[PDB]
Subunit: 471 residues, 4 copies
């Protein structure tokens, strides 16, 4: 089966009966909850449908809370919507108002103070484009250079302009709280610019007495300028291509993507590639050739996971989008699971041992590679390498199974907390023998460690035949 | 400035005044003429607009005549158009009729004879999908499984069906004739399945007493089965992804693409990657992130040329599409012009010599690599390798400059037919000195051959300082 | 201290009291007992002085019994020694006689029968060369073409003439018996021509109910023609350059040597390079520059062991010879322990596991690599790879320690037969902690296997800190 | 046939009739003239016999004048030779004496002034070793610690003790003058310690108005400490292993040798490996297995040339020594001519062009590589790479043919100074076609340059069929 993992975003198109279920059945590995949209009741109901379907199918399904971050927006228009046509003069004010066609508010209150004649304003990820002509007191006077519909609270971007704003807004703090309490497995922060941003997220987590892995969304120049530091301070990264391709020139994105994936894999952190991978499937039952290409190349780049946004959240073919993404990933992997080699020899015990384990399993035509992990790390150091062999993570911490739902190639098995390595290995035999797929005599390579139940204690590789007396 | 070449398709959106001119000024290297649409007067007028703009700007612009081939189609409906909704029963007959919703003709007369219950019919390249239920004499009874509008003479595709049909129809023969006489520099044949197909194209060329390079369009499984033989019998190949992605499962296309490009480069034949690279720019001023990726990755794959179809032929942003494709290609090449290495060491004299010439130029920080060529071959054996240095082809055959407009990284200079290599070299100095770019003292590496004016006599490499007495 | 092993041959110059002891103290790893020379009493006495010195110093010292095989020889001269000068006529007879300058016996009784005028006779490995002029009844009449001293029972070689003679003579069978019962650790067979030769040696071993590893000496073309098969049927090989350099053109020996060493290492069998490595030290206190080169280059070739013959057996500087060979080996290893890479990736479980163990140890700056071995194999699969880390074999079978005395870079530790791997590892800690070299906290990488005490069960690698509770 | 070059030293054993001739006929490429020994009349006579035999056979033979340098020596004994046995007390005096067993003069007059108890004195390159016990006035009182024969004017070495002595003595200056005027092609300087030493040799050359290439003999640690700078300031280097193996521990010589050869080849300077390569052939008709190895491994190291010293100069088998060295070199090359790759990509025009020329010739199965050279450089940059193809240097300077006698794999052809490259190529065809061996139609690859007759102008490669009109 498929190795590369699939992240799906939930929304109106996944709300009806049995749709969340059918997505899990079709292969969804992580469900994204977008806190830019919806009320807490919608998110509750959806969280529940994921848990049910996960538990009922037996498939792991992580739940990802995506926080809006310091997204700058327009306010409200008197009609709810207007049309901004090429050639029109429009004012965007930091003063309060119900907007109209001619004059509308924004949420960023430093706009008149930070925007200068010449600056470009892109709306809703680039559809509508303005150029700033002047700042008159509170108003930024602009000319529509590319026309289109604008509506209430649509997002805007000021490329190159330096935005001042806290990494977490008060809204994000409340959403993070709601999300932690409700049980989500991972958290994504929009618009990260600094490694220190993760500290503020942890500050909230600790007040509430609950940490989960934090994903840095990459969609700002500052973030790419600090890519290594952010990859190291955060637990995963998402190449967030939508905003990234307006905050940076869109022509720079393909290579940023590839550098971000390599850097994640060098440091054994998960990476998700997001946004418009199958955009046209919002309206159509089959994607474009660009889209099919984009997906396959994301796999070849070495992405742990690929994401669907409006394709599943608001589109007309949520299911077909997931199956389609899965067919493409599988076509590529059947040919080869190879990923770009690492540019360093492993130095950490867990890295070196997981790298050796891979060598061993492949060179002996082993039936699976198995690694025990308490925090996920030992598995992530193997996953990053890619291998055509099954990679089965074993753990006694349930949440790690959900967290590893976004790690390449990896199936997770929950087992009791064992106090010996012999016991870890008996647990492997038991879990595997319940599967039609494995039988006595099957050769596997097991990575484990003592002291048991200690993160990072990983220190042994054992070649084992299932059921046989060789331990 | 850009190395990878851009092919644009002409149609209604480029008929408007001085649009062809603006495309050449924006970077168009080859103009595609699609004989599936338009009358001979349209194609004449457009050919002329290209010649004018080429000659007036000083930019080379090849003209590519694209022949429809044995394209299967529906006939005509009494209303001109209908809606085929999921659930409905439709008959496709090999008998003649003015169609209706329920019953419409097809041009493939073996359809009732070659279709079995269960076969799939994709219409309009997949915006309508039917399954064959039964054959009653002349009629193929189907059920619409995916619904949409159909109109007069829309194309259909019957995946996996073994189609019997001549490589050239009588229409293609008359179009090929019209095109050869009108002066086109290259010819593309749709739906190639065999290396023998090129023989029929040559048969017409020879009757008319005019040969040009023949591009095999790859959009059939039979073509991929025979990829090597077709690459070797034809002068170029085009990865024709639109039809390829219905004739093959769409998920298989990305890897076919990459192996087709490799195979072209191994044998020093041009390759064009075509179709939906920037599809959404038909409606929008900026492409999707999948589209930007698809373009960048076409460059990294090693493609000589990338193509725009409806993006320039019928869309709202023909210019912006070209500029946008050019910005993306340039972003990638600035990082590196590196292409996947060849999987053999060059054996032919011209290959070995062009490979050495590159070694020399790069190792000595030469300003340019310069190669004399009568048919283009010597230059194509260098182009395929990629290099960050300018690659300047020199020739005395005008048509070769146009033919090399689709070869990677290559600019061509026409000069008189010389009777010595010393003379070839004097001509280099003279042509180059008229350029703001070059100056006396500039070191360049020149490939040439004696006997002069004989294809494949290439046998000399000279490291030369422009204007200096070192020959 | 030194990794490459040193084999010394015992004889008259090592018979004095505690010279055997001083050789062990100077570095001797294997003592060669040459059954071409000496009484059973001499070999007994010397075997015992080796056991004593080994047990008294604590250093491992293998004892290698070298069987003469089908060696052709001269008989006795009335003076004991003579000079055969260029130009002289000499008779070598198969009749028994008082030998003199003019006429001397030989042991090969088919000589007069199988010699043709023109056959060449090389004496004492080529210090004297004769050509056969005629056969008169029992005498082969020759002319000295290259002159030199000859003595009693010196060997002869008849190149090209294919000799008829059993692989083991009746004398070799009795010597093999005497040697097995006396306790020797290894057996060498001179003049091997076939892989089936090892079966005859085993036939004797099995009659007597005691096997030891059999070294094939390579000094016939038939042996080089069958190198791979012999390396696989025998347990070790010796490049026996003395006879090899007359049976083959001497100019072909250096490359045969190198191929034979590579072949041994590919199949994890020990290889010794023998004869004239420091020949001049028979008479002189310091070797030639050729000799010092020949030793260094034997190390770089990848030899497990280098041997001294007359340098220790009959010469004036047995001790200095050993120290000198050791200084040279050490100078080379201090630079690098690199050996030519193997031309295949490991496939046997023990090969794959030992190769991984090396990777792990080096990458984690381990203090040693430790491997449990019952037959030696697991350790030989690591030794062959070379590594700058100590390679410590653990075993419960004493004779294995002596057998591994000829395996590169390897020290052995005897410990009790354990019934678990935990127990094997406790034994590592205990053995090592007694030593100045190791202390608690020291990182080591241990290879072991279950089921315990089973040859080839090797199946685990454990990264262990000495004395700490991580098992 | 043989690529590696063979240097022979002339002396008493080559004064015998027609011996110089027979050496040239057997393969000698360079004749070494050792100014440590002989009258100017002997060196004249021998120079002449080399010129004659070179001109009579048609074979190139360089003449190398070897300057004694600051060599410290014993004086004369009143038998001409004595035996210094372990345990004896010996005096070495800086004063005048009747020289005997007990007391002998030395040439180094600072010896009593520079010697401390404990200093070691090695004689005749180490075949007698003494330790200094005291200095009494003019005498250095010693104890023979390693015994052996000593004779008149044997050299001595004082390791660690820093000797004061001019790089060129008065004698060397006169010998250098005599040698330049007599016509020698190259000069070797003994005991080089500094790159500035070559300046002093040039200073003499320039006074006399004639330069030849200077070989730095490497036999002091100071020279190895400065290896790169010396290889760059001098035109060639000789690994002078005799003195180097007493001035350094002999165990360190083999690795110095290999590093010195690599360093020579990186900078396109010739390297000779000298001394005791086949030492035993002084007395014996066949060498040891160490010796045969030492020669083979010198070839594999990448030595341009190997040298014989006493093997030809004073020994009993000068001819057989040369033939034997040639057999061994050929045996190795028949297997492969490969040399250790260079650790840099070529940057100099001539390096890059010669490296390309090699690529081209081998990839096209050319019959030869031909390079024009005025100073030899262009040919040395190719030779260093090794190739199995004939490498034929062309030049208009006769002395260059003799100089290139010690460059690997290289045969030279003298031709007129030409005014064009077309002309250089006509001359190739003419010179080659006079040979039975070459024939019209043969493909060859020629390296040449304009402006003509200018060192370093090398700037073209031409692939040429002999006799055909392709230029
Ligand atoms: N099911 C389990 N029972 C006990 N310990 C475990 C279990 N799974 C993992 N561990 C421990 O967690 C370590 C791996 O944690 P980590 O290095 O963070 O991946 C292993 O070496 C084990 O000691
Ligand atoms: N002291 C010991 N006690 C029990 N088994 C041992 C001991 N030493 C080596 N072995 C066994 O020998 C196997 C490796 O031997 P070999 O296949 O010859 O390398 C290991 O897997 C162990 O099971
Ligand atoms: N026969 C010749 N006539 C004229 N020039 C020559 C001849 N042989 C060699 N040369 C010159 O020697 C140069 C190579 O010199 P070098 O850089 O020292 O190898 C070439 O570029 C030639 O121009
Ligand atoms: O040496 P490796 O196993 O490849 O680990 C590479 C890097 O990644 C990890 O995430 C650690 O945070 C780093 O300290 C480490 O240097
Ligand atoms: O050796 P090369 O110059 O790279 O040529 C490789 C191949 O390319 C050419 O296109 C020819 O079709 C082949 O006959 C040739 O073998
Ligand atoms: O290097 P390996 O994969 O462990 O193979 C080692 C080879 O030599 C061993 O000594 C065995 O005799 C062979 O069965 C084996 O193929
Ligand atoms: O780059 P190459 O052609 O190999 O030259 C390598 C070296 O050789 C010469 O001896 C030059 O003096 C160096 O400056 C040069 O870098
Ligand atoms: O946040 C995102 O997904 C984006 O901006 O593409
Ligand atoms: O013909 C084409 O270009 C296609 O179908 O993609
Ligand atoms: O047997 C030997 O030792 C030899 O031939 O050198
Ligand atoms: O000068 C030499 O040749 C030496 O010392 O070896
Ligand atoms: K067409
Ligand atoms: Mg975003
Ligand atoms: Mg098509
Ligand atoms: Mg022997
Ligand atoms: Mg010397």
């Amino acid at each position: 089966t498929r190795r590369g993992k699939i992240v799906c975003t939930l929304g109106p198109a996944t709300q009806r009966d049995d749709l969340v279920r059918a997505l899990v059945e079709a292969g969804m590995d992580v469900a994204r909850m977008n806190f830019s949209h919806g009320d807490y009741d919608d998110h509750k109901v959806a969280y529940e449908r994921v848990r049910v379907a996960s538990d009922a199918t037996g498939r792991a399904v992580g739940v990802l809370a995506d926080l809006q971050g310091p997204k700058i927006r327009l306010g409200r228009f008197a009609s709810g919507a207007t049309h901004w046509a090429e050639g029109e003069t429009v004012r965007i004010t930091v003063g309060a108002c119900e907007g109209s066609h001619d004059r509308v508010s924004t949420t960023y209150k430093r706009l008149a103070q930070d925007a200068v004649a010449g600056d470009r304003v892109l709306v809703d990820d680039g559809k509508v484009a303005l150029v700033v002509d002047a700042v008159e007191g509170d108003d930024v006077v602009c000319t529509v250079v590319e026309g289109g519909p604008v509506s209430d609270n649509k997002g805007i971007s000021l490329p190159g302009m330096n935005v001042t704003a806290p990494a977490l807004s008060e809204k994000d703090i409340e959403d993070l709280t709601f999300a932690l309490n409700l049980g989500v497995d991972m958290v994504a922060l929009s618009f990260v610019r600094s490694p220190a941003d993760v500290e503020l997220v942890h500050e909230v987590m600790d007040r509430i007495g609950r940490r989960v892995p934090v994903i840095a969304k990459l969609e700002k120049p500052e973030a790419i300028d600090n890519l290594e530091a952010i990859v190291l301070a955060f637990d995963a990264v998402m190449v967030a291509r939508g905003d990234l391709g307006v905050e940076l020139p869109l022509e720079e994105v393909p290579l940023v993507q590839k550098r971000a994936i390599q850097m994640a894999r060098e440091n054994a952190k998960p990476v998700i590639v997001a946004t418009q991978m199958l955009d046209s499937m919002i309206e159509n039952s089959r994607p474009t050739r660009a889209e099919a290409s984009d997906v396959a190349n994301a796999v070849l780049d070495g992405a742990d996971a690929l994401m669907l946004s409006g394709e599943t959240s608001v589109g007309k073919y949520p299911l077909a989008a997931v199956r389609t993404m899965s067919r493409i990933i599988c076509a590529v992997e059947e040919n080869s699971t190879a990923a770009p080699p690492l540019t360093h020899i492993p130095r950490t015990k867990r890295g070196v041992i997981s790298y050796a384990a891979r060598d061993i399993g492949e060179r002996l035509d082993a039936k699976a590679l198995v690694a025990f992990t308490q925090s996920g790390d030992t598995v992530r150091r193997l996953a990053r390498l890619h291998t055509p062999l099954p990679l089965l993570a074993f753990t006694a911490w349930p949440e790690v199974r959900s967290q590893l739902a976004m790690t390449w190639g990896t199936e997770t098995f929950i087992v009791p907390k064992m106090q010996s390595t012999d016991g870890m290995i008996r647990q492997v035999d038991k879990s595997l023998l319940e599967l039609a797929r494995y039988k006595r005599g099957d050769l596997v390579v097991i990575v484990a460690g003592a002291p048991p139940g200690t993160v990072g204690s990983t220190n042994l590789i054992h070649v084992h035949r299932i059921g046989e007396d060789d331990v």
